Structures are given as C-alpha cells and as structure tokens.
Automatic annotation (TrEMBL):
It comes from the Eukaryota. This is EF-hand protein. Keywords: Calcium, Metal-binding, Repeat. InterPro entries: Ca-bind (IPR051581), CCDC81_HU_dom_2 (IPR040673), EF-hand-dom_pair (IPR011992), EF_Hand_1_Ca_BS (IPR018247), EF_hand_dom (IPR002048), HU-CCDC81 (IPR028034). One of its GO terms (molecular function) is calcium ion binding. Residues 245-280, 499-534, 589-624, 957-992, 1052-1081, 1087-1119 form the EF-hand domain. PROSITE patterns: EF_HAND_1, EF_HAND_2.
Length: 1218
C-alpha cells in the first residue's frame, strides 16, 4: 500500500534527521531475504524482543507470526493472525513440533555485505523505532522485503505475508531435508456688434448714412454735423432700432462704441469702431444668417459632406459656385483665397465655422444629424414590443413585394408608425435617402442602415478579396496551392492577418461544404453564392432518427452531419395567393403558358428549380424581395429537398414518412425491458421454424401476434421497408448478428462505421433509411462494376453531369431499390441527399465521396470474421472446426468450402468461395494456424424474483406434478402445510436447490408459521412468452426422438453408448457426433451448427455445460401410452428388468431352442408370456403397455428371432456394467 511506503520513508527521514539510510535499507533487505529463506526452509525464526515466525497448527499449515510480550513493555500486545483482508487474534500456544532456530546475525551480515555488529545495531535501531511508533500509533504497517507488511491495529499485530510465498511454502514441513534445502537456495458685446453690422449691411448704409439714421431715430430729424449721443439716447434708439438686444448687450455695445470714453458717441468714435467690409463673403454669411440655414444643408448644397476630405482652392471655388449660382469665377476665387488665407487646404470644420452656419442641437452620437436620427430610430426599434413591426408595415404597403415605395407611401408608413417622428424630421430624412426610379425608395436599404466577426463577414471579405485582384475560382485555388490546412494558412497570412489561425480554421471548416478535407471549385461556388442561409439551423424538421444540432466540431477524421444553407422559412397562404394572382395576371398579359414558365425558369434544363436560379430568373418577370422569394420557394418545396420539379410546381401553381417504423423500434425496445429474457431467447422468440432467419413471414407473425399490430395496417411495402431497416448486411435474411445489432445498438454513439465502411458521421442514426439506401446503392455499384469512375461514366452516359433522369432510369432497370419501394418523392429526396452542395447534379467527386468507402469483398470479410469471433470461444476451437477434424491440422480448399457452406448456408456461390480462398490463403495451396489467426483476428424483492425465475426454469423438465406432490403431503385437504413437509416435498422434487434459497422460499411463503398451497401454485407458473418458447421445440424434438426410437432403440441406450468417457456427463462434441450419426443413419441432411447449439442449450436445463442422465431422460421423456413408456424408461425398474433378463441368457437359449426343435414358432404372445413368467419368478412385475420396447424392435416379418434379441441384450449389459 502507499501508506506503508510513506511510513517507511518517514522512518528513513527521521533516521536521516537524527544522523544529521543505505545501511538501514540494505540491512532490512538482507533480513527480508533471510526470513524468506528460513520460511522456505520450514524452520521457525525466533528473534529476541520481536517474537517468533512459525507455521500454523494443522493438514496444511499457514505461516503465523507471534509477537513477543517484550516487544512493547508495559502495554499488553496480543498475538493475532491476518486472514480475509482482516486480522484476527490467535490462541495457539504450541508450535506443533516445528523446530525453531534463532536469528543468525552472521548470515544477515554476509547478505547485507556489512559488519555483523553494524547490521545488528541497525536492526536494533529498527526494533526500538518500531516500538516507539507502537507506543505512539495505534495502527502500524511496515513492509518486509520479500515477506510482506507487518500490520498493527487496535493492539492486535500480524504480518501480511506474500501470497506467492504462501503458495510456495505450502507443504514444506512434510518433505525430506534435501527438498527443503533445494527450495531455500537463493543462488454679449460680440453679438451686439454682429447685429449692428448686420443692419448696416441690410439697409445699404455707409458710415455717414448709418450715423445720420440712428441720430434721426434717437433724437428726431436733425441737421447738425456735431451730434453726441449719450447712454439713454442710445438705449431708446436700440428700442427704436429693433436690434433684439438685451440691456447687457446694449451697455456693452455702447461701452465699445464710446472710444473716447466721454459718455457720448461722436462720429470720430464710430469711424474708429466699425470699418466698411463690403465683401461677398459677408453677403453669403448674412444670407445664411437670415435664412437660418443649417450647416449640413449648406454643405450638401455645396456638394460636400462632413466626411469629405480637406479641399484645395479649386474644389472650394467649385463648391462656392454650386452654393451661389450668380457668383462669377473671379469672385469665387477671391472668396476662396480669403477663406483659405495662407493654407493650401481648408478643413471642412474650418469652412463651417467660417460660414457661421447653424449647428443642430441635441446631438448625442454623431455630429451628422442623419446618423443621429438613424440611431434614435434604431433605439426605438428595439424599444418596441415588436422591433419587426416597421418592416411588416413596409411589406404590407408594398403590394408587389418589390421592396420599393414612393415618397408618399413611405411618408405614410413613417407617420403611421409609433416611432414618434415629427413631420419635419420625417421629410428631412427622405430628402437624403437615395432615390431609385426617380420617385421611389428601397426601404430594405433603410432598414439595413438603421440596423448598422461572423460567417457572413468572412464570406463577404473572401468574395471581395477574390474580386479585387481578378481571380477566377480555379485560378484562386491554384494561387493558394502555390487542402484545409493550406487554405487556412493562406487565409491567415494573406487576408485575415488580424484574426487568429484558430478562427481561420473556424471559418474554413464552414468553407468545407463537402467535408472531405478538400476544397474544390464547387465548395467555393456554393459558399460564395448561398452563404446567407447558414443561420437557419433552428428550422430543419428533426426526423428524430437525427437529433439536436451539431456544429463543425473541428474533426480529426471523425466527420459530422450537414446543417447548412436553405431558404426554409415560407410565406403564409394568403400572401402566396396574392403573389400568385399578380404573377398570373402578368403572365396572362405575356400570353405565356404555365409549362412554358416551368421550362423557362429551368436555366440549365435539368428538370428542377434551385434558389439561385429561381432568384436570378423570377426577378425578370416580377420584382420580389429576398424574403418573399425565399419564402415562396420554401412553400413550393414541401419535400424541402432543395429542388422543385415539374409536378410539385404544377401543384403549387394549381405525403409519407417513416416515424411509424422507428416508433415501433422504440416500442419493441421498451417491450424487451419487462421480459428479462436474454438476447438469444428473444431471438428464438421470433424464428419459430428454427430457420435462424427472420424472413418477412417470421417478422409479420411476430408483429401481429405479440405487438398486436392490426392486420389492415400491414402491407408488403412497409413490412419490406422495416425488414430492410433491420437488415444491416443487405442479405435479405436476418441472422443473429443482424437482430442483435438491431436491438442493442445505441443511437448517438456513431456505431454506423460498420455500415458505411469506415466513414463516421455522428448524431445520425445508423437506422435512418436514407443511409441504408445509400449502402444498398454502394454495394450494388461495387458488385456490378469494376471502378467507381467506370460506373460514374456509364451511368452519366459519358457526360460530366448526372441528371435525375439518368439515375432513376438506372435504378429502375437495375432494381437497386428493390425492397425499399421508394416513391417518386422519396427518390427525389434520395437524389437530393446524394447532392451535398445542392447543385441539383452529381459530379465525379460527389460519386467517389458518396460510395468510395464500400467494398463488397471487404464487407464479406469482416462479416465472416465477426461471425467467427462471436460464435467460437477461442480462435483455437474455430480453427479446429474449420479443419473438419483433419489429422494434419491444415485446411484444404474443400474442407474450408464445406465449413463455410454449412455455417452460412446460401450466403455464397462458387466464385465467392474461390475469392474467399484467394483472400485467406494469400495464394498458398494450404493454410496453417498462423495464417488463419492473422486472417481471422427492497433488494429482497428482486432476489426472490430471480430465484422464482430460476425455479420456473428448473421445473420445465421435471415430469413430477408439483400439485400432485403438494396434495399428497396435504392429508386433510386443509390447504396449509408447515415447514417440515414443505422441505420434504421440495427435496422430493429433487430441484437441486441449496439450503439458503429453500429457506428463502420458506420466508416467501411463511404465513403465521405455515405454508399455503393454492396461492403458491398461483405465484409460480409459466409466462406467455415462456409457453410460446416451449411449444416451439417439440416438432424438431419429436422427429429426433422418432429417429432415436426407430434406430437407436431408446434414448437411454444411445446416451450410454455416446458417453464414451463414462463420467455420466456429455460435452458439446459428443452431442455433435450424436446428430452426425443420427443424420447419417436417417438419410436426412446434416443439421448445421447453430441449431445444434440451440438444441444443446434447450436440453441443458442447468447451464453447467454438460448433459447428465437426468436431463437426457427428462428432455426425451416429453415425447399416455408413449408417455408412460418414457416414464418407465427413466426408472430403475427398466435397467433392473434388463439385468434380470440378461443374467439368465442360457435359460432362454435352451428354452427357445427347445420350442424351435418342436416346430413351435416364437411369436409375440409366447415370448411375452414367458418373459412375464420369468419376471414373476424373480419377483418383478411389468406393465402390459411397456412390453413393446422390450420386444417390438427384434421382430422381423411378425416373428421373434430370439438370437438377435439375446445378443443385443448381451451387448446392452456389457455396456451398462462399466
């Protein structure tokens, strides 16, 4: 144990610490070797202050270590012994005359290669340290090298010796000395100034005119040149000058104007304060001010936006000429020069600041009010109860689903929404939305902008990366090549530098549609064209054979299923009707028929419709948004197979499933739960003809009888479908392996490698009929063609694309789907399943990926070796059986062929057998064992339930009636019997029950100290399933017993004869020769192996591996006149009568010769009367019905030839005696 080693290292560490180890280690090892030697010697080892090692008292003797009373002073330590993981005390004070020697320190010294005194000192250190522990530890365990662990617990001590040592020393104390010896050898102012200037420019007054003007306003019409204005006159003027200035602005303006600070504004101060700036720049500024133009409107009028890069003088004058239509180029250049100053470029912020435009208030997210309103609309949208209400209203107002609405309708939808948008905000938004078709707006673009790292971004970036540098898809593939890993590395190094290579793999695994590990042109095409639908995995209809959603798990080689692109969401019926009405009226205007549209939509003329082709084609008639087209496409494809054919598109223009079969699979699995019978028994429960094969007849019988399925619901088609679902190996007949794997296999562990020939796909049931049909397809292809390329070419008819017509024609004239009976829709979905990229056609690579993993020769091989492994205990018994008893232990072609034909009838033809020989022998004319090995490598309630089941099994062959015995021990017919007579009755039944379980039955049936009978009989019986099993075996057994009677006379005599070893028990080999002899004599065929083993298990009711005389009788006792004949056969009276007949042979010789000499024929009556008289003379009486067995066989032509009977009886005795 680890604790013992830890304690030993603890002792060593303490010793090392005290010293501050090798000596002590070597000393302990040497002492252990010495103890091992002496224990092998059989001599006791007495060591002072330890105790003595000795063997136990007898008989064999177990080593026992006695602890000395001086091992620990003051604390009594008792002598104990270890047994059964436990340590028990020992109370033997005598050594049983076992000579005991003292410890030899010189021997231990020479073993340890150290000084004898040193070894003694170390060993004494060991004893003292052990004693100190035992004083301080209640529990002590210490190991001895080559002996075991010295264990202490609760003041009880013993040593856990080595088990191998114990077996070795067993029997030593009785052998001579030499053998022991051999065994033991181990060799404000600014604003006011602006307002005053604004007026001065407004009324076109210069300094003179403006001065005279406000002088007139403040002081009336005056003509004096020298006019001075004080603060009060200036204020009343401001009131009369409507400058909209408050008192503070007025005071600041007056203070600034009064340059001399004399309290009066003379004309000198006003020339000093304001200068004539008659420039068009101030004109434009005044225009912006009076019209109250916002900044962004002015910018867009000039042709520039907030994000426009800095502009030079040329773009500046162009924008200015855009702003003012009347301005000339020279004036615009002057204005641009003034604006720029000494800078080559003017920033747009500088331009806006200089223009003194109006900035919008309450900006939160972006200086542009357009993005501000977009963000506010967004926040309200996810603040809605339904964020999708706006798009629903937009679609409702779009009667044609064009995605396009005029200004009026888009306006109306804007007002009618809850967005709480003002009319001014609403009409401001529209003016900057792009206008398609003059007066129409695409609201999907608006929704995308308002809404505005994943698979979509990765696909878009990859597409742009491909497009920018002008590479076609094969050119891109070749450039990358200059597999998944290379693609990932190239993407990480050339495109997505900012993403981790792990994320690059995370995207490339989605780039691999076909999941073969290789990215071809089709993968890139599908990924670029239909990437948008990678997030509709929540809408696939879960056929519960396939469960849950599973992602790209970054497979090593173990791949997964496909949850990928499709437009699965569908429009509702009313809107589909509206769209159909519109499209049909446009077609009627076009005068273009339905089937004409159907052919026209099919661009590639393949007979089907795909989402890419439809989306690119239907838009050429009616403008439809992506959601509308996708939904109507989903509505058409009720099969959801990725294609829409002529018929379904007619029907939309104008099913069936497999839930029942898998549901029955679950129900059958549940019904197995209650039974408790084994897999072999439940397999026997179906095959009622012992045919080992559950054909359609056997399956339907089991279905309608047990499962109580209505006969109206069972037709050939679905029964064949269920049978094909069961049949793993597609053999048209279900053996033991087939049904066993049907019942046992788990759904979610990917055991379907055995089906798909090594290819693994997880979370897909092996029992899905799609995969079974694929397996049948692959096996037929491998059987009827050489190379998959050749098969692809011939099926495709030397074409590059395989259409649905070619495939259905080939399966029809090939009968490859016989037994599945798939309908047209089912064939369409199968062809869809074969198409991984949903292109509507299969390429050569598709064919190879779909069927490359199947090999009928290989499949043949693993099926054969699986059968061999399961049905033979070892490879040796197998090889011996296939040797057919050959004395050279080498299997020639004929022997192996015969073995294969017998073991698996009708599986193979001569060519298959020759191929088997070629495969197994590797071209050698003979096969040996090495080649064969290589080629073929309350709890009580359940306890009583088990015991009752065992007793029901054991009472099957007992001919004695339990009721009869129970009544015979019930004298008064009261119905209660006490324990003693119940025990005697159970013994009389001779059920071989051990005392513990008969006491268990006593506990079961104990009521007030008595056992009750009627309810006991009610409790133990035969179940319906057991009765059905029992009824099955008579007919085979009845004819076997018929042959035994006719040829082997009686079963008892045949049992005696074939018990060659004379142990009273038969193995399976003697039984094999039993059927061999019976078939040879009877002229019937050799019964093959599995029927033989099943009959052997039926006869062997004890499961002990052998058949005794009792079971041999009881099984054969089951087949009134014949019943009593079988009864008397098992009796001691039968053999006693034979012996009494045979002991007097000479008497019958003389008597029969005397009758013959008197010309008296020996008929039946005379012989029977004489034998009865002889039996009466010996005190034996015989029943009249039991005469024939004694006499019928020896009769020839109606006469009894005595010599034949006498000789066979003599042989009978000669066999019986031994």
């Amino acid at each position: 144990s680890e604790q013992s080693l830890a304690s030993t290292k603890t002792q060593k560490l303490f010793n090392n610490l005290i010293s501050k180890e090798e000596s002590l280690t070597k000393t302990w090892g040497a002492f252990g070797l010495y103890l091992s030697r002496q224990l092998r010697m059989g001599r006791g080892t007495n060591i002072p202050h330890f105790g003595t090692f000795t063997f136990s008292a007898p008989q064999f003797r177990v080593p026992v270590f006695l602890v000395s009373k001086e091992f620990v002073l003051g604390q009594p330590i008792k002598t104990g012994i270890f047994i059964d993981k436990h340590i028990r005390p020992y109370n033997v004070q005598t050594s049983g005359s076992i000579s005991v020697t003292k410890i030899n320190f010189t021997e231990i010294a020479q073993y340890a290669d150290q000084n004898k005194e040193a070894v003694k000192i170390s060993f004494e250190r060991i004893i003292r340290q052990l004693a100190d522990q035992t004083r301080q530890k209640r529990v002590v365990d210490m190991e001895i090298p080559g002996i075991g662990v010295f264990q202490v617990r609760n003041n009880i001590a013993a040593v856990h010796f080595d088990e191998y040592l114990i077996q070795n020393i067993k029997g030593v104390p009785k052998r001579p000395l030499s053998e022991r010896k051999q065994k033991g050898d181990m060799n404000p102012l600014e604003f006011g100034l602006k307002r005053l200037k604004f007026w001065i420019r407004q009324n076109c007054f210069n300094a003179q005119d403006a001065f005279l003007e406000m002088c007139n306003c403040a002081l009336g019409r005056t003509r004096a040149q020298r006019v001075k204005v004080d603060y009060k006159q200036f204020f009343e003027a401001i009131n009369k000058m409507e400058l909209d200035l408050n008192e503070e602005q007025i005071q600041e303006l007056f203070k600034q104007l009064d340059a001399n600070k004399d309290g009066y504004i003379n004309y000198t101060d006003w020339r000093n304060t304001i200068k004539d700036d008659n420039d068009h720049l101030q004109y434009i500024k005044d225009v912006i001010y009076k019209r109250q133009l916002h900044t962004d409107d002015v910018l867009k009028t000039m042709g520039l936006d907030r994000e426009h890069p800095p502009i030079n003088k040329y773009q500046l004058k162009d924008a200015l000429k855009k702003l003012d239509l009347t301005l000339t180029d020279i004036k615009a250049i002057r204005v641009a020069q003034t604006l720029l100053g000494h800078e080559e470029y003017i920033s747009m912020y500088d331009l806006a600041r200089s223009f003194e435009t109006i900035e919008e208030d309450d900006k939160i997210f972006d200086p542009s009010w357009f993005k501000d309103i977009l963000y506010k609309i967004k926040q309200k949208i996810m603040a809605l109860e339904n964020p999708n209400e706006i798009r629903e209203s937009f679609e409702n107002y779009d009667e044609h689903n064009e995605g396009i609405l005029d200004t009026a309708n888009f306006k109306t939808c804007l007002m009618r929404s809850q967005l709480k948008l003002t009319v001014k905000e609403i009409n401001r938004i529209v003016r900057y939305l792009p206008k398609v078709k003059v007066n129409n707006i695409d609201y999907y673009n608006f929704l995308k902008l308002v809404e505005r790292s994943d698979i979509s971004e990765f696909a878009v970036k990859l597409g742009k990366f491909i497009k920018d540098k002008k590479f076609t898809i094969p050119s891109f593939l070749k450039t990358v090549r200059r597999t998944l890993t290379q693609m990932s590395e190239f993407l990480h190094r050339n495109v997505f530098k900012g993403n981790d290579r792990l994320d690059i793999d995370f995207y490339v695994n989605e780039l691999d549609i076909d999941c073969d590990g290789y990215i071809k042109e089709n993968d890139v095409q599908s990924f670029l064209n239909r990437y948008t639908y990678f997030d509709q995995t929540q809408y696939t209809p879960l056929s519960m054979t396939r469960s849950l959603t599973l992602k790209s798990l970054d497979p090593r080689t173990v791949s997964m299923n496909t949850k990928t692109l499709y437009p699965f969401k569908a429009l509702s019926e009313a809107k589909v009707d509206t769209i159909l009405r519109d499209l049909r009226k446009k077609m009627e205007l076009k005068k273009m028929k339905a089937a004409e549209l159907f052919s026209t939509l099919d661009a590639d003329q393949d007979g089907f419709l795909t989402i890419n082709e439809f989306s690119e084609n239907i838009r050429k008639i009616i403008e439809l948004s992506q959601p509308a087209i996708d939904g109507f496409f989903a509505y058409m494809d009720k099969l959801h197979t990725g294609m829409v054919d002529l018929s379904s598109f007619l029907k939309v223009m104008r099913e069936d499933n497999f839930d029942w079969e898998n549901e029955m699979v679950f129900r059958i699995r549940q019904w197995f739960k209650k039974e408790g019978i084994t897999v072999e028994d439940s397999f026997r429960a179906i095959d009622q003809n012992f045919k080992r094969e559950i054909n359609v007849d056997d399956l339907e019988i089991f279905l309608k009888d047990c499962l109580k399925v209505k006969s109206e619901e069972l037709n050939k088609a679905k029964l064949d479908r269920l049978f094909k679902l069961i049949d793993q190996y597609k053999r048209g007949k279900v053996n033991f392996v087939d049904w066993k794997r049907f019942i046992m296999e788990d759904f979610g562990y990917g055991m379907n490698q055995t089906i798909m020939g090594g290819k693994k796909i997880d979370n897909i049931s092996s029992f899905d009929w799609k995969i079974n049909a694929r397996q049948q397809l692959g096996l037929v292809l491998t059987r009827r063609f050489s190379t998959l390329s050749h098969s692809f070419d011939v099926i495709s008819g030397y074409r590059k694309k395989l259409l649905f017509s070619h495939f259905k024609k080939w399966v029809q004239d090939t009968d490859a789907l016989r037994g599945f009976d798939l309908t047209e829709s089912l064939m369409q979905e199968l062809f869809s399943d074969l198409d991984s990229h949903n292109k509507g056609y299969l390429s050569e690579s598709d064919w190879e990926i779909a069927f490359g993993g199947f090999d009928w020769e290989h499949q043949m091989h693993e099926e054969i070796k699986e059968y061999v492994k399961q049905n033979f205990k070892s490879i040796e018994k197998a090889f011996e059986f296939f040797c057919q008893g050959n004395q050279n232990k080498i299997i020639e072609q004929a022997d192996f062929n015969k073995a294969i034909n017998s073991i698996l009838p009708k599986r193979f033809i001569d060519s298959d057998l020759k191929d088997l020989w070629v495969y197994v022998s590797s071209g050698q004319p003979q096969v040996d064992f090495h080649r064969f090995k290589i080629a073929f490598q309350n709890e009580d309630d359940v306890f009583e339930e088990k015991l009752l089941s065992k007793i029901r099994r054991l009472l099957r062959p007992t001919i004695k009636s339990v009721k009869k015995v129970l009544e015979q021990l019930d004298v008064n017919n009261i119905g209660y019997i006490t324990n003693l007579e119940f025990r005697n009755a159970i013994k009389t039944l001779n059920l071989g029950l051990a005392q513990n379980e008969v006491d268990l039955l006593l506990n079961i049936c104990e009521i007030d100290g008595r056992v009750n009978i009627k309810q006991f009989l009610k409790f133990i019986d035969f179940s319906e399933s057991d009765k059905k099993i029992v009824q099955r075996s008579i007919l085979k057994l009845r004819e076997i017993t018929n042959q035994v009677y006719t040829f082997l006379l009686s079963p008892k005599d045949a049992f005696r004869m074939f018990d060659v070893d004379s142990n009273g028990y038969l193995d399976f080999d003697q039984f094999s020769q039993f059927i061999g002899k019976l078939s040879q004599l009877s002229g019937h065929d050799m019964l093959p192996y599995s029927i033989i083993k099943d009959l052997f298990e039926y006869i062997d009711s004890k499961k002990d591996g052998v058949i005794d005389q009792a079971e041999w009788m009881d099984i054969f006792n089951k087949f009134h006149f014949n019943q009593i004949l079988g009864e008397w056969g098992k009796t001691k009276e039968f053999d006693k009568i034979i012996i009494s007949i045979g002991k007097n042979r000479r008497f019958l010789l003389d008597m029969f010769g005397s009758l013959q000499q008197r010309n008296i024929p020996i008929t039946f009556e005379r012989a029977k009367a004489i034998i009865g008289q002889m039996l009466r003379n010996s005190g034996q009486s015989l029943k009249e019905e039991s005469w024939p067995i004694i006499l019928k066989f020896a009769e020839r032509n109606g006469l009894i030839d005595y010599k034949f009977l006498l000789e066979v009886y003599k042989e009978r005795i000669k066999r019986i005696d031994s």
